[PDB]
Amino acid sequence: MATVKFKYKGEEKQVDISKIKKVWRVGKMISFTYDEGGGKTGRGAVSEKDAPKELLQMLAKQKK
DNA sequence: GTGATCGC
DNA sequence: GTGATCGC
Numbered sequence: 001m002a003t004v005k006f007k008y009k010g011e012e013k014q015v016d017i018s019k020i021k022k023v024w025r026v027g028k029m030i031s032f033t034y035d036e037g038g039g040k041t042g043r044g045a046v047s048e049k050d051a052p053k054e055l056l057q058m059l060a061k062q063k064k
Numbered sequence: 065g066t067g068a069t070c071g072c
Numbered sequence: 073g074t075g076a077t078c079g080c
Contacts (some may be wrong), residue, residue: 008078043077046078
C-alpha cells in the first residue's frame with residue numbers, strides 16, 4: 001500500500017510495498033524481491049534506518 | 065562476508 | 073556454479 005524507494009543498478013526505483021514478494025535482513029540492510037511485469041522478479045535493498053514500517057513488519061512475519 | 069536472488 | 077547486486 002505504501003511505497004519503498006531504492007536505488008538499483010544506478011538510479012532510483014519506487015515500488016508499491018504490495019508488490020514485495022520476500023524480504024530478509026542482512027545486518028543493517030533490508031533486502032527484498034518484488035513482482036514486476038512479464039512474470040519477472042526484481043531485487044532491491046534499503047538501509048534499515050528509515051525503511052517503511054510496512055516492509056519491516058513483513059520481515060518479522062515471514063515464515064526462508 | 066553477509067542472505068538471497070537474478071541472469072546467466 | 074557463480075558474478076553482480078544491495079548496505080554495511
